[PDB]
Amino acid sequence: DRGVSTFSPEGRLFQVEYSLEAIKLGSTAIGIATKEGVVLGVEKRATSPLLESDSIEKIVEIDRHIGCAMSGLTADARSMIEHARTAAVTHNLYYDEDINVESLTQSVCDLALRFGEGASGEERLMSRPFGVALLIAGHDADDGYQLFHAEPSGTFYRYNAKAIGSGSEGAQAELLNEWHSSLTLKEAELLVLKILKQVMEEKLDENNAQLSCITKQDGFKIYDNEKTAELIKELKEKEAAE
Amino acid sequence: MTDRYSFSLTTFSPSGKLGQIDYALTAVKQGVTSLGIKATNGVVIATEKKSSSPLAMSETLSKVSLLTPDIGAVYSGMGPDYRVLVDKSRKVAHTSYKRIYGEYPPTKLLVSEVAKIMQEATQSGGVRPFGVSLLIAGHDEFNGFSLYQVDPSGSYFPWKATAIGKGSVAAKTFLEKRWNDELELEDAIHIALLTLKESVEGEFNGDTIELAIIGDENPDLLGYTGIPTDKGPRFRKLTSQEINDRLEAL
Amino acid sequence: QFNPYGDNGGTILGIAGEDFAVLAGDTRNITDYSINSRYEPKVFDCGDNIVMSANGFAADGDALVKRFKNSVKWYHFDHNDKKLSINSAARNIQHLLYGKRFFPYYVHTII
Amino acid sequence: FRNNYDGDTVTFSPTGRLFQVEYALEAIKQGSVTVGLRSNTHAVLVALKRNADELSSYQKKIIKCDEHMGLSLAGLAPDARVLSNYLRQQCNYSSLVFNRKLAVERAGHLLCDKAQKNTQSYGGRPYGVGLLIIGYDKSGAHLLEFQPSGNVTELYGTAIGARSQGAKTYLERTLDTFIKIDGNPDELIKAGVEAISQSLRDESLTVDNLSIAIVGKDTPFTIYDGEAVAKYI
Amino acid sequence: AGYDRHITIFSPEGRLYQVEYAFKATNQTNINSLAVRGKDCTVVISQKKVPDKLLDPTTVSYIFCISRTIGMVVNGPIPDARNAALRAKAEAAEFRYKYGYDMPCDVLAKRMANLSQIYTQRAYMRPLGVILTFVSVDEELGPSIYKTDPAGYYVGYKATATGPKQQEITTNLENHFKKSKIDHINEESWEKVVEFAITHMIDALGTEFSKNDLEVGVATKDKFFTLSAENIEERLVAIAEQD
Amino acid sequence: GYDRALSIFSPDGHIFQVEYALEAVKRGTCAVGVKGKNCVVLGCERRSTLKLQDTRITPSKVSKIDSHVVLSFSGLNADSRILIEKARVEAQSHRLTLEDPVTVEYLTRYVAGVQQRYTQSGGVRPFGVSTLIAGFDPRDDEPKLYQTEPSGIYSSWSAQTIGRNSKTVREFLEKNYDRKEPPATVEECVKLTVRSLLEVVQTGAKNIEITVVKPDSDIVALSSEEINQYVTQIEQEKQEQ
Amino acid sequence: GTGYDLSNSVFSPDGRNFQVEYAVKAVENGTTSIGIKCNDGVVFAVEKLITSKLLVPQKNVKIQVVDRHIGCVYSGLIPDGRHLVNRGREEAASFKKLYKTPIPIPAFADRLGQYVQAHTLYNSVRPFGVSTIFGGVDKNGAHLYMLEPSGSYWGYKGAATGKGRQSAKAELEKLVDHHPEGLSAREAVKQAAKIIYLAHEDNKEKDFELEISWCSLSETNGLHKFVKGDLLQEAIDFAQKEIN
Amino acid sequence: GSRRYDSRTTIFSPEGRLYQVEYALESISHAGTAIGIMASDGIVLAAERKVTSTLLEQDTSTEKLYKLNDKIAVAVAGLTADAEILINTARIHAQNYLKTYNEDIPVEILVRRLSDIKQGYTQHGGLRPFGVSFIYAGYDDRYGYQLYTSNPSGNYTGWKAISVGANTSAAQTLLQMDYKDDMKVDDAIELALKTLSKTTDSSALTYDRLEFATIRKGANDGEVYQKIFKPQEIKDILVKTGIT
Amino acid sequence: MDIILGIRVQDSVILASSKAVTRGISVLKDSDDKTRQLSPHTLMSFAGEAGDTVQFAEYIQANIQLYSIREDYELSPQAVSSFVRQELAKSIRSRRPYQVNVLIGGYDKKKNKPELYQIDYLGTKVELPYGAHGYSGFYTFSLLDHHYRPDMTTEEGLDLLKLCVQELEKRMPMDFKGVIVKIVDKDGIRQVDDFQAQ
């Protein structure tokens, strides 16, 4: 065969690139950052009708001021979320303060290349990279509302808007167009709902898609289905207006 | 540095074979003949010294070894594998037994400790099987005299008589024909000598043949007197002369 | 029998004004009835507008201060040069001290 | 050749090459260009930052290691985060234990020896990032180039990343002139931004796109980005 | 692939190819050696070749002083040889310290032969490409020659030879011993036993030697040592008179 | 120190060892769970291949993890014993430190985590097992039924099946299970469970085991007679048609 | 079937370790470096290629000191060389710690020898991609050694390795013949500059910087020292003068 | 380095089977048949020794039937030496349990433990699995006489009658045909031997080719007894049941 | 120390255990129940050092409950007591030994008899018709040696405990605030809600 941390002749780590392939197969996840807050949306994609869709938990809280959405091999994300929570709570325990969104993102990305076979770096055992991308959104006092794309290569970009998952270059082109700096929270909500609506195979409803946001006032909330139903209604109505 | 070969080197092929064990038995096949014969009052083990140079001093290389005062071993296959097996068997006789019960292990128990060492080399990370079959002859109070064969797999079986190595199919046939339940040690020694002659190309004598027995207690080999319940070893290597003395009677 | 602790003397005083703070200390460092030094400063500017003194056994005091200054340095690297607010400093120091709960730094410390 | 010998860092090719090392070297060549240069009084880093979208931020290429030392990267960013973090500790140790600022030259030796350990043993991979280290120590100004082969070189100026050859020629021509910009931080930086322009076939260096850092005689290692680099475009 | 030919596991003919290949390596130096036993001494002769003029001839040697009593000549690449040397020295010192007497030649050989047996059995260790010839005047057994190889074999010898032209010397010594009917050289002085060694080396190989073409080690009761270029010259001169 | 990476990504981004682990589940005896108004029932098929079995002693397929939660599975029997044991140790540990028994979701999350982890650790292969976990949260009357798989993914189900021919029996439940009107009795929930296996067991009086779980730690395995009564009644109704 | 060369400690059927042989190739591909033993010391010299004007002159020192009295120089993979020297430094410290005296050069040679050999015993390591020339002065004389990737080493009168090793050897042999009672530290220094200059015809494509060090009982008090300023310049002149 | 030589013993095929497990079972199918039969008043274990020779000591020999406890025994099919490894640990386990609880270990608990040890070699470690199948005959006061089987996968199941080793399908069919729930032990002895006699690849079934044991309530006592039949006793019972 | 008394009668095992918890100078509690049900027919009472006491009982309880679920079966009293004894015997040679003394009262369903086991912190186990730890035996053994019959009903057993407790409340210098009394029989474990006024 050939080792897990070999470079290709092009300068890329095989395992990491193949990992990126697994992410393309994943449910769509969309984040949009505004001055009124960050919105995180995801396609649930229940694999069969007898599945109870509220047990699909693809948006999770990390702390009051930070949440995230996932796409790809989502079971891979559980230990990342755990490390994440632990890092935020620990930072608060050591410093009597909230962890910055960035440092939290950086901490989660440090896990990423910690894979190998008894390597020549430190003491970092995990058999393969993670197969899941994360969108991390929060607020902190120094840099306001923030959205980050944490990848299994260990790099993380800040975005004003970002889609990940199977509908992603489609939706990213779409966000390239719609996002402007003065978007209101309601606008962002509506925009995320629309774009999942476009790229989903299924007909978007409040059971197969899910919204959440983070604001400085109320923290990170997953919207219940009633609230999202109303916002779907509102969006159909506004489209049917030209 | 550091053994990073922590997976098995012997594994199962589609047909159920364990290749490395099979290949070890092949190495044994080409080994010089060795044999054991059990009589009513002792056991004899024998083999040819197949010296690799007449410039060698063949008495500085025993193929017959004491493991305990009452147990001896001989082999066929790779000598260096045998030698270290002997070291480990002598040791285990002490650490797994003498230091616990204050006596030497009975033959079958020692044999089973040897066998386990061999089994482990068939399964542990990063080793090959020992390329030998042992014959182990011994006596103990509660079991009497016995003779055991131990193969690369770690399997052992008790024998009335047997041969291993180069000419063993003929020798076992010769032995099936001559063995009976009434043999006395001198008779067995005699058969052993006759059986051996069949496998030996060149000179046949007390210098080119190696022979030990498990027989009576030899108090004259104990080294001390005054404890009447110690009568000394039952294991004895025959000398060059003792062997020749018996080839006139051949 | 070896005593890992000693007493270097010193007295220190911290007062919180409404928009200023002072932290003061004498400069005498002693050992029994001898003066080791008449001027050995004991109150330190630690960066980010925080002054600190750790009084009692000086060797422990210096270790602590040094470790806290180093912690300010690392706070900058890990948190994108963010300012270490006084309350955040205080919590940090509690963890530095409690880390040696079973072999304490023998100091009363004021920031 | 290649085929059978590029499978791990523990294998020589039949001509004596180390392919996994060259492949890691290859990740540098496809990084965004960055330039270092220095006079007798200052050292300057300039890097071109790549974004991902027009919706994304530009990824940072300069990392500060101590008050008197810092670096730029091209290649795998997380590898730079590892190595600069190690450099941070080496600096810190020197101050804590010897009360002494780590010489820029020792820093290079330490980086070389860390890199090397990942090119001779099983299960490791080389680093796949290249590094330009500037510093101002007891012997003045210094620029170092680190390659993940472990080769560390001290130079007046250099560039690494895609199309770095432009800048490298420019600087090789400017040598006698830029080495003399003593006590004029702004001129030397302008000389660096010129160097870096020799490497844009690309497009045009802008305000969320340019990054510059500087260290020297009475100047702690400091980083400029955004409105803070406006005066140089 | 042919994996069984890369590590020390059995081929289907029950062979260890890596061990065979290690024996090949023992000949890369193209040096022959021989050892013989006196009445109360033991002699090892080894060819000394110094191809390069840039070399310091005083540092080219395959003869090692293992302990006060034990000497060792190696046939094989120098680096494996020195690995063996350093180990045997370590083993000889520890034995003495643990058990209160000097390690016997035969027992050192058994120990190094056992270490070799292990390389033959564990995959992660290669065999060493060397054959080791150990010599002493052992306090119990008198003059001794014990030779170990990459298979983990060893035995004692009346005399023995090693290297590419091993056989020529071997048959020459066999012939000497078929005639003399005893298992040693019958000389009272080591000087003469060195003379016999060189003589039979010259006759077996068909060559003359200067004082720089040989290297010589001698064991006597309580000492093993090597001869200087000058010591050897005195010995070449001696063989030349009367002959 | 054996740590070879056995679960790795291949070029199209799959993890073959996990995929192949599902192939093990595929070939396992069918298991089904269906939840009622105030019950969850777990059905499993036994093989016909050999029926000289001693059924008093042969490990049953449904295991109690605690007095209020059960687990069944499809795939490698021996692998399942590792998960069941870890699960049982964890339920006791949770009671000991939290002073309450585990919720069904909690127990599921635990098992799936174990499964996930054996897909990114050196020197191990993934479990060749999917599970159905079912029961009632302490002091709660609302039934729970969860499913885990070798990858570590889990979720809850109104009704669900795993293992061989699970396609068929799924198809059945998808057009026989009404979410507005879940089975109201133990009796009708069991019936639907047996009905669904009858799609695939084919003459299975004794070739069907059933486990009924009700609120407050009231679990009970059905005997061959009781189950047989159910098969009988389903045949008679099929033959008005 | 073959493939005997894919893995570090494998004997080929003729008994060779191909990986070591390939490590030699990386050496052969290196800059030339040399050592000359004089009659109270040793001199080390090396060719440094000026890839470009941008390399700060005098600053990228190739020759390394071990303890206080040992110099080593090497050709091949430079980081491998440093790693060899780090080990040598530990190895001499330990020896000095235990035995008080500074490590004798023969003792020291074997320490490097064993370590480098070690790296031909396993397939979990790679051999060293350097040859090292090294030596210094001890309680009984000057000593000069060269140590190959196999771990083979001997004492030398003069030694050379790298791209230019054939000219260097031939030059070195000339010296040994035309000065049979010895050479002086001063003469050795000049003679070294010369040989490095001659050696530089096979790398004729790039510019170079000369680096010299010595350890001599009379001239440096048995301590290793870099040849600086006036003596380096004089040496350069000699070589320049003698090139025509 | 070492990676290249790793067989990967613990991985799935694309069909989701464990290669080594299936290959080990293949090996087991070539072994002497072992039969165990359960009755109301006892258990029979019968097994065929594969290969003999007239020189084999039958008196001192055991290749098939081993005591675990005073109440538990096993029959082995596969690699003897592997079986001894397991049997020894199973013996330790029974004693641990006795020491901890002051009660003899219930049969299942012992069987599960051994099977778990087997399963491990299947999932972590990179070692070849044990080439062993066991039939366990035991008795405890919870379930009475119990018969189990376990193979190299570490799966185990319980049985009223079962075979392992060669020809198990032929043996299983015969057993299924003549086995009845109310069977008494003496019947079971007959059935077990008749079945072996019909299924062998030997010309006939002689005493020297069998191992044989019963676990009965001892006839006269009130408590359980294991009888490993001496060679003569096997000869007797072979005639009693009319196979001479 | 606390009061820990057991009596095994014809058909049941009775355990009586004092209610006080004192930390030095104050009684912090007068209703403490010094008991853990290990299995539906097995009860364990305990006294000794402050935290070890409940940590140990709860640890035992966890293990038996684990076994109960693994085996789907309820270990015999004698089996449980041996397990507990081994735990305490380990503990006596560990870094910091559990200083805990226990009574185990069980009704063995397979034998149809009650069983009472006394085990101190050394792992010194004995089976007994009646027992106690600490000082309680010194005041009550002589009454129990007198009136005890193996044929006693549960009700006679209670009157005999009543007496034991009264001798304690007369002669023992500490106020232990009465006892909680539990019965273990074929039907499981029940608490006598009235020993205050019974």
Domains of chain A, by residue range, sit at 1-242
Report yes or no: I110 at the H interface, CB cutoff 8 Å. Answer: yes
Q: Contact G7/E6 with Cβ under 8 angstroms?
A: yes
d(CA I169, CA I175): 7
Residues in chain G with CB shorter than 8 Å from the CB of E77 are 150, 152
H108 inside 8 A of chain B by CB: no
Residue D140, by phi and psi: left (phi above 0), alpha (psi -120 to 50) or beta? left
Contact E3 H2 (CB under 8 A): no
Rounded alpha-carbon distances, angstroms, from residue E177 to B51, B208, E202, G105 = 16, 18, 17, 45
Instruction: Tell the residue number behind the tokens 């199919």, with chain if given.
Output: B169
What is the architecture, at CATH level 2, of domain B1-250? 4-Layer Sandwich (3.60)
How far is G199 from D177, CA to CA, in rounded Å?
Answer: 34
Chain G hits for H2, CB-CB cut-off 8 Å, are 123-124
- CA H149 distance to own-chain centroid: 7
Cα–Cα distances in Å, from H199 out to H163, H165, I95?
11, 11, 61
3-class DSSP state for residue F168? Answer: helix
Alpha-carbon distance of D18 to D1, in angstroms, equals 11
d(CA A212, CA I109): 58
Q: Which residue of F has its CA nearest to B124?
A: F2
SS3 A210: strand
Rounded Cα distance between H171 and F238, Å, is 40
- Measured CA to CA, the distance from residue E43 to residue E220 in angstroms comes to 9
| Chains F and G touching, counted as 3 or more CB pairs less than 8 Å apart | no
**C45 has which bridge partners?**
C51
Contact by Cβ (8 Å): I2, I104 = no
Chain G contact for B1 (CB, 8 A cutoff): yes
Q: Which of F2, F3, F125 to mutate to test the interface with B (most CBs of B within 10 A)?
A: F2
Q: Is G16 helix (H, G, I), strand (E, B) or coil?
A: coil
Give yes or no for a contact between F83 and F115, defined as CB atoms under 8 angstroms apart: yes
Report the distance separating Cα H204 and Cα H191, nearest Å.
16
What tokens were used for H237? Answer: 């019972």
DSSP codes joined into one string, A63-110: ETTEEEEEEESGGGHHHHHHHHHHHHHHHHHHHSSPPPHHHHHHHHHH
d(CA A220, CA A147): 13
Q: How far, in whole angstroms, is CA C95 from its chain's centroid? A: 14
Q: At CB < 8 A and 24+ separation, what contacts does H173-176 make?
A: H174/H198, H174/H199, H175/F52, H175/H35, H175/H37, H176/F51, H176/F52
- Residue H22: closest CA among chain B residues belongs to which residue? B14
What is the domain range of residue H239? Answer: 1-244
Asked if residue B70 lies in contact with residue B139, where contact means CB atoms within 8 angstroms, the answer is yes
* Count of structural domains within chain D: 1
CB count in 10 Å sphere of residue F209 = 23
Any E CB within 8 A of G13 CB: yes
The C-alpha atoms of residue B209 and residue E153 are separated, in whole angstroms, by 19
If we measure between CA atoms, which residue out of B78, B159, B66, B158 comes closest to residue B112? B158
Alpha-carbon gap, residue A149 to A219, rounded angstroms: 20
Nearest to E159 by CA among E223, E127, E204: E204
Angle between helix H168-178 and helix H185-199 axes, rounded to 10 deg: 140
Please report, for residues F63, F104, F111, F155, F167, the alpha-carbon distance to residue F35 in angstroms, rounded to integers and kept in the order given.
Answer: 17, 13, 21, 14, 19
Resolution for this PDB entry, in angstroms: 2.6
At position C95, the amino acid (one-letter code) is H
B187: exposed, middle or buried (Cβ count in 10 Å: 0-12, 13-18, 19+): middle
- Asked if D150 and D112 touch (Cβ cutoff 8 Å), the reply is yes
Strand arrangement of the beta sheet that strand H72-78 belongs to: H65-67, H72-78, H132-140, H144-150, H156-158
Q: How far is B226 from chain H (nearest CA, A)?
A: 36
* Pairing mode, strands G141-147 and G130-138: antiparallel
Q: Do D53 and A172 touch (CB under 8 A)?
A: yes
Separation CA D152–CA D161 (nearest Å):
16
CB B75 within 8 A of CB B31: yes
Nearest one of E133, E146, E6 to E76, comparing CA atoms: E133
The span from the CA of E225 to the CA of D14, in Å, is 44
Parallel, antiparallel or unpaired: strands A144-150 and F144-148: unpaired
Q: Which residues of G touch B1 (CB under 8 A)?
A: 118, 122, 124-125
Distance CA D138, CA D104 (A): 9
Per DSSP, F38 falls in state S
With DSSP H G I counted as helix, E B as strand and the rest as coil, what are the percentages for chain A, rounded to 5? Answer: 35, 25, 40
Touch criterion met for E and A (3+ Cβ pairs within 8 Å) = no
CA distances in angstroms from I42 to F88, I37, I46, I76, listed in the order given: 21, 6, 14, 9
**Max CA distance (Å), chain C:** 50
Determine the Cα–Cα distance for residues G101 and G69; give it in Å rounded to an integer. 12
Q: How far apart are CA G5 and CA A46, in angstroms?
A: 53
Distance (Å, whole) CA C59 – CA C40: 13
> Which residues fall within 8 angstroms of residue A207, CB to CB, at 6 or more apart?
A44, A53, A225
Under 8 Å between Cβ of D33 and D161: yes
Q: Quick check: is G220 catalytic?
A: no
The pair phi, psi for residue E232, each rounded to 5°, is: -65, -45
Cα separation, H150 vs H113, in Å, equals 11
Q: Name the pairing type of β-strands I113-119 and I100-108.
A: antiparallel
Token readout for F28 is 């396992």
Token pair, residue I173, equals 């210098």
Cβ atoms of I114 and I13 closer than 8 Å: yes
How many alpha carbons lie under 13 Å from residue H101 in its C-beta half-sphere?
Answer: 18
| Method by which the coordinates were obtained | X-ray
Q: What is the side-by-side order of every strand in the sheet holding H34-39?
A: H161-164, H34-39, H42-48, H210-216, H225-228
Cα four-point dihedral sign H196, H198, H201, H203: positive
Local structure of B213: helix, strand or coil: strand
φ, ψ of residue E131 in degrees (nearest 5): -110, 130
Query: In this structure, what DSSP letter does residue B97 have?
Result: I
Tokens standing for B91?
């040791």
Backbone angles phi, psi at H25, to 5 degrees: -60, -40
Q: How many other C-beta atoms lie within 10 A of the C-beta of residue C111? A: 18
Q: Is G70 exposed, middle or buried (0-12, 13-18, 19+ CB in 10 A)?
A: buried
- Name all contacts of G82-89 with Cβ < 8 Å and 24+ positions apart: G82/D109, G82/D112, G82/D113, G82/D116, G82/D150, G83/D113, G83/D116, G83/D117, G83/D120, G83/G128, G84/G112, G84/G115, G84/G116, G84/G128, G84/G130, G84/G132, G86/D113, G87/G111, G87/G112, G87/G115, G88/G112, G88/G134
Domain boundaries along the sequence of chain B: 1-250
Dist CA G187 CA G193 (whole Å): 10
Separation between Cα atoms, residue F112 and residue F114, nearest integer Å: 5
Q: Tell me the three state secondary structure of residue G140.
A: coil
Distance between CA F141 and CA H220 in Å, rounded?
56
Closest CA to F49 of F27, F71, F33: F27
Q: If you classify domain G1-244 with CATH, what class do you get?
A: alpha beta
Complete DSSP assignment for chain H: -GGGG---TT-B-TTS-BHHHHHHHHHHTTS--EEEEEETTEEEEEEEPS---TTB-STT--SSEEESSSSEEEEEEE-HHHHHHHHHHHHHHHHHHHHHHSSPPPHHHHHHHHHHHHHHHHHBS--PPP-EEEEEEEEETTTEEEEEEE-TT--EEEBSEEEESTTHHHHHHHHHHH--TT--HHHHHHHHHHHHHHH-SSSS--GGGEEEEEEE-TTTTSS-EEEE--HHHHHHHHHHTT--
Task: Give the C-alpha separation, H210 to H62, whole Å.
Answer: 10
DSSP B56: B
CA max distance for chain B: 63
Residues G161/G133, Cβ–Cβ less than 8 Å: yes
> Domain F1-241 falls in which CATH fold?
Glutamine Phosphoribosylpyrophosphate, subunit 1, domain 1 (3.60.20)
Superfamily of domain A1-242: Aminohydrolase, N-terminal nucleophile (Ntn) domain (3.60.20.10)
Q: Which pair of tokens denotes residue H71? A: 């109440």
- Report the C-alpha gap between C10 and B240 in whole angstroms: 94
Q: What is the 3-state secondary structure (H, E, C) of chain D?
A: CHHHCCCCCCCCCCCCCCHHHHHHHHHHHCCCCEEEEECCCEEEEEEECCCCCCCECCCCCEEECCCCEEEEEEECHHHHHHHHHHHHHHHHHHHHHHCCCCCHHHHHHHHHHHHHHCCCECCCCCCCEEEEEEEEECCEEEEEEECCCCCEEEECEEEECCCHHHHHHHHHHHHHHHCCCCCCHHHHHHHHHHHHHCCCCCCCCCCCCEEEEEEECCEEEEEEEHHHHHHHC
- For residues G99 and G163, is the Cβ–Cβ distance under 8 A? no
* DSSP at I20: -
d(CA I35, CA I103): 9
- Smallest Cα distance from C17 to chain A, Å: 23
Cα–Cα distances in Å, from F42 out to C75, F70, F218, G112, I70? Answer: 55, 9, 14, 70, 19
Instruction: Tell me the β-bridge partners of H42.
Output: H39, H216
The two three-digit tokens of residue A213, written as one number? 């946001």
Q: Which residue in chain H has the smallest CA separation from F122?
A: H124
* Residue D115 token pair: 């890199």
Q: How far apart are CA C109 and CA D148, in angstroms?
A: 46
Sign of the C-alpha dihedral computed for residues H112, H117, H119 and H120 taken in this order: positive
**Secondary structure (H, E, C), E8-51:** CCCCCCCCCHHHHHHHHHCCCCCCCEEEEECCCEEEEEEECCCC
Residue ranges per domain, chain I? Answer: 1-198
- Residues constituting chain B: 250
Catalytic residue, from G31, G32, G120, G220: name it: G31
Q: Are C109 and C89 in contact (CB under 8 A)?
A: no
Task: Kindly state the tokens that stand for D192.
Answer: 């660096």
Measured distance CA(B179)–CA(H55) in Å, rounded: 8
Burial of H195 (0-12, 13-18, 19+ CB in 10 A): buried
Mutate to test the interface with H, among B8, B40, B130, B173 (most CBs of H within 10 A): B8
Distance of alpha carbon H133 from alpha carbon H153, whole angstroms: 9
In angstroms, the CA E50 to CA E57 distance is 7
Report the greatest alpha carbon distance in chain D.
Answer: 54
User: What is the three-class DSSP state of B235?
Assistant: strand
d(Cα C100, Cα E84) in Å, to the nearest integer? 50
Q: I188 with I195: CB under 8 angstroms?
A: no
Contacts of B177 (CB under 8 A, 6+ apart): none
Facing residues of G132 across strands? G74, G147
Contact between E42 and E144 under an 8 Å Cβ cutoff? The reply is: yes
Pairwise CB contact (< 8 Å): E56 & G9: no
Cα separations in angstroms, G141 against B93, E105, E117, G105: 56, 34, 41, 9
CATH of the domain at D220: 3.60.20.10
What is the CATH number that goes with domain I1-198? Answer: 3.60.20.10
Structure tokens at G134: 């090294």
SS3 B69: coil
Q: Which tokens belong to H129? A: 């699995």
CA D20/CA D13 separation, integer angstroms: 10
Q: Report residue A121 as tokens.
A: 């770096």
For chain G, give the residues followed by a break (C–N over 2.5 Å). Answer: none
Cα four-point dihedral sign H187, H193, H198, H203: negative
Both tokens of A193, joined, read 């709902």
Count other Cβ atoms within 10 Å, centred on residue G232.
16
- Indicate left, alpha or beta for G182 from its phi (over 0: left) and psi (-120 to 50: alpha): left
Number of Cβ within 10 Å of residue A97's Cβ equals 17
